[PDB]
């Protein structure tokens, strides 16, 4: 047989992500045999250990996964931290780890622009929130403001300023100035909230030369529930993917079946599927040190394209071909006729 | 049979270039058609017609193929402007025109990052060019320094000051430096040694560039510099990537390049319109092409039907970052 | 005496850059004299040419403040153009000019944040703008009719119009960023729902809203009224606070960047003059050459290798090492 | 008397940082007062304790300063965390503190452009540096890389490749090496430089060993040379005498440092000038919103948040015309 283990969050802080991560990792699997689960004549079982996103559970998993239920890789896991914990785990039992989506046993998944967005999003997170207000000088923008200030409260954000101007200020060249002056030199968000029955005519005058959002805007609050109440919605990266055949069939069929598209983490673990596959394949064995062989340096296709893990830091780097261009023939052409 | 017009500034100023599209254009078809050169029945046939990147003469060219040669489609050209020209007599010939490398009857390429840097590179050769010389104040520092400035004196930059430190790769020198380029358009301090690092040290927060790095001059034949000017870029591989890098390399020795590429695709477009359309009646193309999805070595194309632009054809993914950051902070 | 002639574009297209240059100028002087508008006993004379913007008119009118009205020096003047051509004729008549703000005769005013601006806006005005249009499938269609009707007196481009049912604009969105993609100078959403389509962070497609700062060319053809305005700061001095004050003052609105352009070279005629000493054009070329004088601005300096001003500047540095050192331990 | 107190780290691991910030502090306060070391009557004294940059002694040397010298008001200090552990004290003793370098009582120094090129430094000093080796394949080539190689392992840095040509695919293999690691990614050359550089490495986020400071400024890297932040200064009266003046008396610039405690000084004598007291309560007051002219102009603070923050007139220019121009 052929046992791979999936650590991952089922439960608690990342149960969303894991979810992802596991629907990917069992439809990649389907993909690369063509749907009949199995590898040159080995079965392919799926055993999978929810490690709550705790270090402590997930080292006892992992270390449960391959001695207990015998399984000859792992990937994992969901919560960084937790990961962390495990890369020891895998060289005491010498058996290799795929870090997925988070020494000679660790293979690692790859750089890529939706962790940077997320390491953003969370630095954001963790970062202090400065907010001033403009409304206008009848009830129903105080009233607004009002009503505001006290959803802003639940939140741990500071009120530098609230700018009354009147129903008919149809230059805001003084409010404007007078809010950017507030929000300044601070760290680390600055916003000015608009509430009307301006956006545009503040828009003009350049916020973010001094760092300050206006209330619209995509996803200029922090993606935490206290904020997300004053704005509803979930804060998304969002990114593209040129066209591929696994890229269809993940899109097709994952829309197909769960009636919405793929995410970037069921794309993840669609990908540790297609390493562990085209690993077990290329070196035609399960053993931990035949295994090591084939990856180093091995190309294996994913939703995101030809990948290969680097040999030195056995990381997965996206895999190219080099294209130059000469530029004489056309600048020695494009002055030559201006004239 | 199904006839394909290649214009291109086959001599002249983009000589270099069209040999690229020719090759690529050869290669794009072989591999559409698994090396039979046929399509559906249909044998294919290439014409091609040096415009020497004149506008007058691409014109006839163009006319000449559609009219003389009887090309069902054209592909063109070298020149950004002799394609101009040309924009006209598809359509006063009925006929389409893919329009490559440079109305209903155009068809065109697409936007990137090679273009971006042909484009910068242009605008580059197009501007001015100061220089600040730093040397060893004795003999051949001074003698060097003459040498350039005999050198520097047939190109057409500046020369706005000379330095001389005795041998001090240093503070006040580069300062000196700065103070001197500084506020000067658009373009460089020009070091003669037997000092980069020192002043590399203080910055360009002035726009200055040293005489280490790559092509901080303009691609002009006029500026010890030898060597041609290339922007670099990578590609994710694929299987016409492959395809084309290995075959190209084990015929021609040498990589493709960027107009190499662009050949390709104009011919997989062609090819894979033709297949689609199943004839070569310039109205039943045009409607087969429009929206249509077609691959190439940079991966897969689709031809926008508003205005027959060609983009890169993408999936769309999003990631949702609350979970992860709700957990960040408790 | 000392006398001064000012170029300008008076009337026609740059009319507004003219008066912000003479305003400056003559409050520069004003400034600089504490109100005696007279120099080392010498009296100050200024002479206005309006030179319409036109390059033939503008060397004429030049040298006809040299020639008939005898002119010590000379500014000007609105526009680059007919600034261009003024270089040989100060030349041709031995005498400085200070080019604002648009030879060992000339000297230039420097390379501003504010310069850069313009010669953006102009770009982009020389640019194509496209637009894609979404609205509720009703006045949607009636309010895009209106707006393809003005619009079409415009010179850009309606590649798509999107109309959806009064929800989740993800799929709709990206109808549009398909429509606008690759496509040259300028994109647009004008919708008839912004913030849900702002979430997908257009600025990666390159595609600007119909709620951005100043998404349309600054030109009378572009619903979008008002002016294009770019904005800068510059720290407090003792000539700003005097220009700001007096200027909000004696007009209700605050000196502009052309207002404080005719000021700094108020500032260096005076400095120069004064250093020199003298009004002979060769011992002011002399004076100036490398001089340092206070403008509204800050401290400036004239680089002698090329008449060009810059900021006068002290450099510092700051030690990192120790700090670093630091915090790994 | 005017008692104004200066904690900071005159020894241990900021003692050169500390140096300055005295130096400007004595230089601000002659400047301010002509000489005469008085302002409106009042004697002015001086009273410095060192922290060492220890949080514990620092709060403990501050308390000492107010309860004991009866110093008036205070600045400091060079730590950052020795003076967050310092703000209460302040607030214990009803007395005002300005914390330089690094409550109603605190009053902040500015954001800037130093301060930001030193955090950075300082992020890049805790993060990897990792190495790839380019020389000549023969004895001194092969021998240079060992020396180096043997100098990299006292460092914390990875050695993930060794490129031997002899004397375009080297730094293809070179830029492989290194692509997608972080941080800090460098090709050592023992010897080919311009070559490289003629592919531009910053799109791999790659340096080149020529390179204006690409190692961590710690003295394991330390490639002689201390690791400078450059910037430059608008000239002004306060600029000219200071780097004057100082250059005259230390034949050496002024500094980062020495400017911030000559912008300190300012605060202080420019409020206890506007103020005409020294009472915690209407020094507040005076200098909430107050201007005061520092070594880099005009600074208000700003009441809000007790925050310095460069003065500035707002200035705006209208393109419409110029377009319209240039269309047309």
Same mark, same amino acid.
């Given at each position: 047989?052929?046992?791979?283990?999936?650590?991952?969050?089922?439960?608690?802080?990342?149960?969303?992500?894991?979810?992802?991560?596991?629907?990917?990792?069992?439809?990649?699997?389907?993909?690369?045999?063509?749907?009949?689960?199995?590898?040159?004549?080995?079965?392919?079982?799926?055993?999978?250990?929810?490690?709550?996103?705790?270090?402590?559970?997930?080292?006892?998993?992992? =270390?449960?996964?391959?001695?207990?239920?015998?399984?000859?890789?792992?990937?994992?896991?969901?919560?960084?931290?937790?990961?962390?914990?495990?890369?020891?785990?895998?060289?005491?039992?010498?058996?290799?780890?795929?870090?997925?989506?988070?020494?000679?046993?660790?293979?690692?998944?790859?750089?890529?622009?939706?962790?940077?967005?997320?390491?953003?999003?969370?630095?954001?997170?963790?970062?202090?929130?400065?907010?001033?207000?403009?409304?206008?000088?009848?009830?129903?923008?105080?009233?607004?403001?009002?009503?505001?200030?006290?959803?802003?409260?639940?939140?741990?954000?500071?009120?530098?300023?609230?700018?009354?101007?009147?129903?008919?200020?149809?230059?805001?060249?003084?409010?404007?100035?007078?809010?950017?002056?507030?929000?300044?030199?601070?760290?680390?968000?600055?916003?000015?909230?608009?509430?009307?029955?301006?956006?545009?005519?503040?828009?003009?005058?350049?916020?973010?030369?001094?760092?300050?959002?206006?209330?619209?805007?995509?996803?200029?609050?922090?993606?935490?529930?206290?904020?997300?109440?004053?704005?509803?919605?979930?804060?998304?990266?969002?990114?593209?993917?040129?066209?591929?055949?696994?890229?269809?069939?993940?899109?097709?069929?994952?829309?197909?079946?769960?009636? =919405?598209?793929?995410?970037?983490?069921?794309?993840?673990?669609?990908?540790?599927?297609?390493?562990?596959?085209?690993?077990?394949?290329?070196?035609?064995?399960?053993?931990?040190?035949?295994?090591?062989?084939?990856?180093?340096?091995?190309?294996?296709?994913?939703?995101?394209?030809?990948?290969?893990?680097?040999?030195?830091?056995?990381?997965?780097?996206?895999?190219?071909?080099?294209?130059?261009?000469?530029?004489?023939?056309?600048?020695?052409?494009?002055?030559?006729?201006?004239?």
């Amino acid at each position: 047989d052929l046992k791979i283990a999936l650590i991952y969050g089922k439960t608690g802080p990342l149960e969303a992500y894991a979810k992802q991560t596991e629907t990917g990792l069992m439809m990649g699997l389907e993909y690369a045999t063509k749907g009949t689960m199995t590898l040159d004549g080995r079965k392919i079982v799926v055993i999978t250990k929810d490690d709550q996103s705790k270090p402590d559970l997930s080292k006892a998993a992992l =270390a449960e996964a391959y001695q207990d239920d015998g399984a000859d890789i792992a990937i994992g896991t969901s919560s960084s931290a937790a990961a962390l914990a495990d890369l020891p785990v895998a060289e005491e039992n010498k058996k290799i780890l795929i870090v997925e989506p988070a020494n000679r046993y660790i293979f690692r998944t790859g750089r890529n622009s939706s962790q940077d967005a997320i390491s953003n999003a969370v630095a954001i997170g963790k970062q202090g929130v400065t907010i001033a207000t403009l409304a206008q000088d009848y009830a129903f923008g105080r009233d607004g403001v009002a009503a505001f200030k006290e959803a802003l409260a639940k939140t741990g954000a500071t009120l530098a300023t609230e700018e009354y101007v009147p129903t008919t200020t149809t230059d805001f060249t003084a409010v404007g100035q007078r809010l950017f002056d507030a929000l300044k030199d601070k760290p680390g968000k600055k916003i000015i909230w608009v509430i009307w029955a301006p956006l545009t005519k503040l828009q003009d005058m350049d916020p973010k030369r001094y760092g300050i959002e206006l209330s619209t805007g995509g996803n200029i609050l922090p993606a935490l529930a206290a904020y997300k109440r004053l704005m509803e919605g979930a804060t998304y990266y969002y990114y593209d993917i040129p066209k591929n055949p696994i890229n269809e069939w993940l899109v097709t069929e994952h829309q197909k079946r769960f009636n =919405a598209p793929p995410d970037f983490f069921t794309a993840g673990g669609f990908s540790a599927a297609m390493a562990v596959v085209t690993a077990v394949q290329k070196a035609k064995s399960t053993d931990t040190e035949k295994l090591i062989a084939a990856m180093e340096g091995m190309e294996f296709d994913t939703p995101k394209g030809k990948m290969v893990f680097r040999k030195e830091d056995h990381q997965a780097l996206q895999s190219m071909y080099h294209f130059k261009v000469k530029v004489d023939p056309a600048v020695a052409w494009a002055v030559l006729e201006e004239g």
